[PDB]
């Protein structure tokens, strides 16, 4: 009635991708930023997809 | 027997096979490409190659 | 500082020590007993301050310095 | 389909191998008789040739009928060939490797994807034996499978310059070849050799077995030596002429020593690095079959 | 594939990986048609982000060929994919799903 | 400079361990405020002699 397997799959996908991006070691401060911004953006994409 | 090469001897031969490229070949025509510059100058390693 | 005479042992030791305190090679300690540490690549990376591609590889993946079979340490 | 005799395809007059010389179609043996060798202080000893790799390179999906004999002969003796490993159509030989493949190797030296009318072709079993080995030319460029291109030339020297005692010994002095010579003699020699239908030789070389094989190896020793000669001139460090009282002796230094040279020269064909790797591979395989 | 030139230095470059994941979802068929060509991009991704695992993987081989009885046979040899290989026996090895 | 090299060899940042011990990075990186919610702390303020 409510849950959608497709959307929820994309949700585990972006979960994995956020774990991937989170473990990405970086040296520059700006890269450090774009990492966390990238994570927020993934959390956005999941809602568009759902 | 293999044939005698024509330049080995002094007779003139007036019918000869000439290889020729066809319409499907073309040489020296200018050619198009997609150049793609690096996203950051500071990401470009010069060495150790 | 001492053009004509031996460096007094106290100064030699204290400077050598403070400089030893200054050094820290990147590494990922592990429990495998077969493992070694690629001293050459680590000290090199450190010397270039991790700017060379090897220094990048090391600053991001220090574990790459650890190795069992000696050759693979570089193949990696 | 061409039947293969109890001897090789090489027994057929259709496949005679003959360099031009003194205005006639000379056999390779009667050219090699002209050759004479000055010894030098250096010695060649022949190391064991490494066993060729088990791998047969993929015959990539190719719609076309590859002209293979032309590719091989030009890669070995061709005056102008280069980047021979760029295209990598040598791998195509492994299409012939399979049992009951549709593909045929024509006497034309072309690898047809399917049997086609009015094109005579070698017996498929023979070609399969031949492809099981020579398809490995297709991996002459890949780093894992490259042949040594220095030590192998020792064998070349022994198989060319070497006296029967030097051959039994496995060690001969490095030699310096020479012969009475016409202008452009090595260019003309190499071009007489590019026209040779060498797949006949390689196919009999891989298919024949028993006494029938050994009887081949004696009969075609001089042919193999002519191929080796052209390669030798291709890799020789220098190729001078000598005045000898209104006669000229061409002289190459040195037999059996690859100088690794790649800059072109008028006197002889030149190997680009790709031709070196290829020729090294070819020698690896061919000498492997030749000594078994 | 309409080739990307991505080097995958910045974290944001995960975007390109995502561009493929979505494509593999919305269009699995077309994806499967171009997947070797997208493996060439992914390899630049893995060699930066996961150099150790990348070395182990590529050491196993960049491609494989299923044989008789269905076993995979990885090449053991790193080599760039070309769409010339799509009609051949070879497969991109990122998609082998062999642990 | 000397004290600096000794300090920064230890690491620009640290993380408190679940066991409570500090664990310095051993790296010299510029801090970003994205790090403020991260596990890491600036090492100047560790108060570890
Ligand atoms: N930078 C650096 N160079 C090294 C290291 N280890 C070996 N080398 C260099 O690599 C070169 C080759 O190594 P070796 O096979 O030991 O050569 P070597 O000349 O016999 O070295 P010696 O023991 O000094 O006689 C040597 O010249 C060393 O200077 C290292 O850990 N770091």
From Swiss-Prot, chain A:
On the tree of life, the source organism's domain of life is Viruses
Q: Where in the cell is it found?
A: Virion
Oligomeric state and interaction partners are given as: Homodecamer; each decamer is made up of two conformers of VP2, called VP2A and VP2B. 12 homodecamers assemble to form an icosahedral capsid.
Function in brief: Inner capsid protein that self-assembles to form an icosahedral capsid with a T=2 symmetry, which consists of 120 copies of VP2, with channels at each of its five-fold vertices. This capsid constitutes the innermost concentric layer of the viral mature particle.
Give the UniProt family note.
Belongs to the turreted BTV-fold inner capsid family.
Which protein are we looking at?
Inner capsid protein VP1
**Highest classification ranks of the organism:** Viruses, Riboviria, Orthornavirae, Duplornaviricota, Resentoviricetes
Q: Give the residues of the full protein shown.
A: 643 to 692 of 1333
Curated annotation (Swiss-Prot), chain F:
Quaternary structure, per UniProt, is:
Homodecamer; each decamer is made up of two conformers of VP2, called VP2A and VP2B. 12 homodecamers assemble to form an icosahedral capsid.
Q: Tell me where in or outside the cell this protein is found.
A: Virion
Question: What's the protein here called?
Answer: Inner capsid protein VP1
Its domain of life?
A: Viruses
State the covered range within the intact protein.
Answer: 545 to 593 of 1333
What this protein is reported to do is described as: Inner capsid protein that self-assembles to form an icosahedral capsid with a T=2 symmetry, which consists of 120 copies of VP2, with channels at each of its five-fold vertices. This capsid constitutes the innermost concentric layer of the viral mature particle.
Family from the record: Belongs to the turreted BTV-fold inner capsid family.
């Amino acid at each position: 009635t409510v849950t959608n397997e497709f959307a929820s799959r994309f949700r585990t996908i972006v979960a994995t991708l956020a774990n991937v991006v989170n473990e990405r070691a970086v040296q520059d401060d700006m890269q450090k930023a774009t990492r966390s911004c990238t994570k927020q953006w993934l959390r956005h994409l999941e809602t568009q997809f759902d | 027997q293999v044939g005698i090469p024509k330049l080995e001897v002094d007779h003139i031969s007036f019918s000869n096979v000439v290889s020729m490229m066809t319409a499907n070949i073309r040489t020296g025509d200018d050619m198009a490409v997609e150049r793609v510059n690096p996203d950051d100058v500071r990401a470009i390693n010069i060495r150790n190659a | 500082k001492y053009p004509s005479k031996a460096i007094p042992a106290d100064e030699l030791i204290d400077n050598l020590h403070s400089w030893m305190r200054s050094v820290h090679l990147l590494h990922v300690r592990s429990e495998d007993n077969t493992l070694r540490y690629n001293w050459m690549l680590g000290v090199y990376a450190r010397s270039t301050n991790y700017t060379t591609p090897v220094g990048q590889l090391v600053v991001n993946a220090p574990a790459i310095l650890n190795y069992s079979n000696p050759q693979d340490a570089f193949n990696s | 389909m061409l039947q293969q005799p109890t001897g090789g395809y090489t027994t057929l007059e259709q496949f005679a191998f003959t360099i031009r010389n003194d205005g006639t179609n000379a056999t390779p043996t009667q050219f090699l008789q002209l050759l004479s060798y000055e010894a030098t202080e250096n010695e060649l000893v022949k190391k064991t040739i490494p066993t060729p790799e088990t791998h047969l390179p993929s015959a990539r999906n190719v719609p076309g009928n590859v002209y293979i004999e032309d590719a091989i002969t030009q890669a070995l003796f061709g005056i102008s060939a280069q980047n021979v490993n760029a295209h990598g159509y040598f791998s195509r030989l492994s299409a012939l490797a399979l049992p009951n493949t549709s593909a045929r190797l024509g006497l034309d030296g072309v690898i047809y994807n399917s049997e086609t009318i009015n094109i005579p072709f070698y017996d498929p079993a023979a070609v399969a034996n031949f492809a099981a080995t020579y398809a490995k030319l297709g991996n002459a460029s890949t780093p894992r499978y490259r042949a040594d291109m220095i030590d192998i030339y020792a064998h070349v020297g022994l198989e060319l310059a070497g006296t029967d005692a030097e051959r039994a010994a496995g060690v001969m002095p490095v030699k310096r070849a020479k012969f009475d010579s016409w202008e452009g003699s090595l260019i003309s020699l190499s071009r007489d050799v590019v026209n040779w239908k060498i797949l006949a030789f390689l196919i009999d070389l891989c298919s024949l077995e028993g006494e029938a094989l050994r009887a081949f190896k004696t009969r075609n020793r001089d042919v193999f030596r002519m191929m080796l000669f052209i390669m030798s001139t291709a890799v020789a460090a220098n190729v001078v002429n000598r005045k000898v009282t209104k006669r000229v002796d061409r002289v190459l230094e040195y037999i059996g020593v690859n100088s690794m040279r790649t800059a072109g020269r008028t006197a002889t064909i030149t190997y680009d690095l790709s031709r070196h790797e290829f020729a090294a591979k070819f020698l690896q395989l061919t000498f492997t079959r030749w000594n078994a | 594939l309409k080739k990307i030139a991505e080097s995958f230095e910045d974290p944001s470059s995960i975007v390109v990986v995502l561009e493929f994941i979505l494509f593999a979802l919305f269009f699995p068929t077309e994806f499967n048609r171009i997947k070797g060509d997208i493996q060439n991009v992914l390899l630049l991704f893995f060699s930066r982000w996961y150099p150790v695992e990348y070395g182990i993987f590529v050491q196993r081989g960049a491609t494989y060929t299923i044989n008789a009885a269905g076993e995979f046979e990885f090449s053991g040899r790193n080599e760039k994919w070309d769409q010339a290989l799509y009609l051949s026996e070879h497969f991109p090895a990122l998609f082998s799903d062999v642990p």
